[PDB]
Amino acid sequence: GPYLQILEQPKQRGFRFRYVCEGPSHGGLPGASSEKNKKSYPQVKICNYVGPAKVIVQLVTNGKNIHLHAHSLVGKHCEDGVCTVTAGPKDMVVGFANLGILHVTKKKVFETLEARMTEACIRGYNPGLLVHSDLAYLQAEGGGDRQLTDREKEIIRQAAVQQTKEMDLSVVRLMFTAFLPDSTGSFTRRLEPVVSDAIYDSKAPNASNLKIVRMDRTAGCVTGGEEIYLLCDKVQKDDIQIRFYEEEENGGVWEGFGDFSPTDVHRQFAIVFKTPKYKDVNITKPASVFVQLRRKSDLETSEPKPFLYYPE
Amino acid sequence: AYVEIIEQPKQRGMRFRYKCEGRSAGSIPGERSTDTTKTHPTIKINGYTGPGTVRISLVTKDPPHRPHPHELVGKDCRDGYYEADLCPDRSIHSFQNLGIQCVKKRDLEQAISQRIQTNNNPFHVPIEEQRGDYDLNAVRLCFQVTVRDPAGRPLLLTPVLSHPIFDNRAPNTAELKICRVNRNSGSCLGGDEIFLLCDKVQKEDIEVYFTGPGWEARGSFSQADVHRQVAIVFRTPPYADPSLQAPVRVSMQLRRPSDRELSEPMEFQYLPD
DNA sequence: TGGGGACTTTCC
DNA sequence: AGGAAAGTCCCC
Numbered sequence: 001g002p003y004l005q006i007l008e009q010p011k012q013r014g015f016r017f018r019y020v021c022e023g024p025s026h027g028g029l030p031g032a033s034s035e036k037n038k039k040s041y042p043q044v045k046i047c048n049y050v051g052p053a054k055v056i057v058q059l060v061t062n063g064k065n066i067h068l069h070a071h072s073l074v075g076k077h078c079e080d081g082v083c084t085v086t087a088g089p090k091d092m093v094v095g096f097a098n099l100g101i102l103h104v105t106k107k108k109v110f111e112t113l114e115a116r117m118t119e120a121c122i123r124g125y126n127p128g129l130l131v132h133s134d135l136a137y138l139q140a141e142g143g144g145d146r147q148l149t150d151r152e153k154e155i156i157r158q159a160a161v162q163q164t165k166e167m168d169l170s171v172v173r174l175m176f177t178a179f180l181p182d183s184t185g186s187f188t189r190r191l192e193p194v195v196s197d198a199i200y201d202s203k204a205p206n207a208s209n210l211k212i213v214r215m216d217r218t219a220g221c222v223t224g225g226e227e228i229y230l231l232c233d234k235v236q237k238d239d240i241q242i243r244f245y246e247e248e249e250n251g252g253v254w255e256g257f258g259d260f261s262p263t264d265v266h267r268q269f270a271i272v273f274k275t276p277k278y279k280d281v282n283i284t285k286p287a288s289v290f291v292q293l294r295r296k297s298d299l300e301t302s303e304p305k306p307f308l309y310y311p312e
Numbered sequence: 313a314y315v316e317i318i319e320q321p322k323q324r325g326m327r328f329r330y331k332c333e334g335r336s337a338g339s340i341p342g343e344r345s346t347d348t349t350k351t352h353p354t355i356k357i358n359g360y361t362g363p364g365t366v367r368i369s370l371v372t373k374d375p376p377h378r379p380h381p382h383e384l385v386g387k388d389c390r391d392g393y394y395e396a397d398l399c400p401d402r403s404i405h406s407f408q409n410l411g412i413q414c415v416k417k418r419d420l421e422q423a424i425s426q427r428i429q430t431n432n433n434p435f436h437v438p439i440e441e442q443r444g445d446y447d448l449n450a451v452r453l454c455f456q457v458t459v460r461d462p463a464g465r466p467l468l469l470t471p472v473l474s475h476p477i478f479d480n481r482a483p484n485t486a487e488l489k490i491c492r493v494n495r496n497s498g499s500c501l502g503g504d505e506i507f508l509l510c511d512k513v514q515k516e517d518i519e520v521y522f523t524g525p526g527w528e529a530r531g532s533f534s535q536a537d538v539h540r541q542v543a544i545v546f547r548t549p550p551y552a553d554p555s556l557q558a559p560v561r562v563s564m565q566l567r568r569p570s571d572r573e574l575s576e577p578m579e580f581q582y583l584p585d
Numbered sequence: 586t587g588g589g590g591a592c593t594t595t596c597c
Numbered sequence: 598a599g600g601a602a603a604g605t606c607c608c609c
Contacts, residue, residue, distance in 0.1 A: 270509050
């Protein structure tokens with residue numbers, strides 16, 4: 001039957017969440033597209049369609065299960081960290097251009113959280129499935145400002161607490177939901193929700209785009225243990241590693257790992273390391289590998305810089 | 313009866329702390345100090361010995377010495393000023409409990425309000441002057457002592473100021489400090505690339521000052537070359553002598569144009585061409 | 586409709 | 598005590 005499909009996921013790596021104190025129109029969640037002379041932006045499309053229909057977008061978690069994230073989506077048609085774009089004609093594809101991630105202050109997570117779960121247990125379209133599934137029920141019908149059960153608000157509220165401790169504010173995920181015409185009028189029915197790849201805040205030190213800005217010597221002897229000054233970009237002293245490497249014919253790669261210590265990682269943007277022994281110290285002709293910064297934790301690497309293992 | 317500072321507070325190097333950091337965690341040390349034989353600011357009341365009060369307070373680093381918005385904190389500190397009874401059987405007394413608590417720029421009015429609510433101003437500067445924006449990056453201690461007059465009533469000695477003290481956090485008011493360093497030999501001709509691993513500097517106002525008394529030269533580089541306030545990549549300066557024969561070994565040190573501070577130098581080995 | 590560097594405060 | 602993170606400012 002009908003069903004939302006993701007025509008284009010969000011860029012995922014490279015979009016800096018912006019604090020409510022930075023300014024509107026600071027950037028826009030890009031779609032997964034660099035493609036030279038051409039912008040991009042996330043977009044979804046129904047299937048076995050519904051002519052006219054409305055789709056709302058909101059931010060969920062990234063862990064094992066999909067929960068309601070404090071940061072809110074902010075852009076044109078957005079309001080209350082939700083965005084009601086309507087895909088209601090003869091054309092189902094519906095993009096979400098110029099969207100943004102308000103970065104919530106640690107200081108204010110519980111508050112926005114409780115204030116989100118709550119403005120959702122009263123929806124059903126936002127089933128207790130996301131707050132306290134103890135809340136299991138609801139559908140869509142309505143209930144604007146409708147009171148919630150006193151004991152209810154609690155299971156909501158306390159959920160708006162044991163989850164805040166677990167909420168990672170450095171990563172989010174889009175949660176596109178489609179609603180369609182029902183019982184004459186109302187885009188009453190929740191047509192299965194789709195959730196996007198993880199979007200990693202660009203400012204989290206843990207999410208930085210390892211880049212090799214400069215380097216002392218490009219070449220070096222194979223005999224190893226040679227000091228080099230490699231000026232990078234926001235690395236994390238413990239969680240970083242310089243890595244030399246070269247592929248030997250079909251498949252099979254070769255790797256070397258610059259020597260050093262957190263000590264040698266000077267002010268997060270400098271690492272002073274000594275070269276390693278190349279493949280084999282016995283080489284009558286200059287050898288060329290590549291060096292690449294590397295985050296130990298996720299193994300996210302970087303556009304590499306070439307090296308030149310000259311003979312002994 | 314006159315006050316005199318026989319040991320100033322260690323000017324550059326201490327980083328004023330906001331009240332929000334675990335409270336305390338140190339004290340102002342004196343110009344001369346080191347972990348083996350530590351020190352703290354001291355004054356020698358001259359021409360009197362005995363009972364009185366030894367009041368201190370922070371003041372503007374320049375001309376109108378207005379009560380500055382930061383606050384001193386420690387033992388016997390209140391409303392921003394250290395105020396206590398000084399030990400009568402000595403004329404030279406130090407304060408090893410002087411903290412400099414800084415205010416977030418936003419509560420900056422509430423403080424200067426307090427610096428006259430609390431009734432605080434050694435130099436009695438007019439409200440008009442107190443309005444001008446502050447330099448929350450540098451303070452002067454203002455020792456103003458009270459001894460006793462020939463009769464026995466309290467006597468207000470002249471307020472004396474100590475060399476300014478500069479924050480360390482403020483990236484522009486810090487102490488230039490080179491760290492590691494790619495190389496240093498170069499040659500008389502100069503044009504060589506060195507990598508410098510400076511301490512947090514500023515690409516607009518800073519610049520390697522190759523020098524050696526009988527000479528002096530900056531390193532050729534550019535703001536673009538200053539990597540995250542931390543790394544500078546310049547090129548070894550042409551030496552004054554561009555036809556050397558033997559090894560003149562000058563000295564290079566990061567210099568900060570604006571204030572002119574320079575750092576402890578290193579040994580660049582300008583070689584024979 | 587953009588984005589990035591570094592300044593200020595806070596955490597540890 | 599430093600060093601970093603968290604959060605704000607601000608400019609090309």
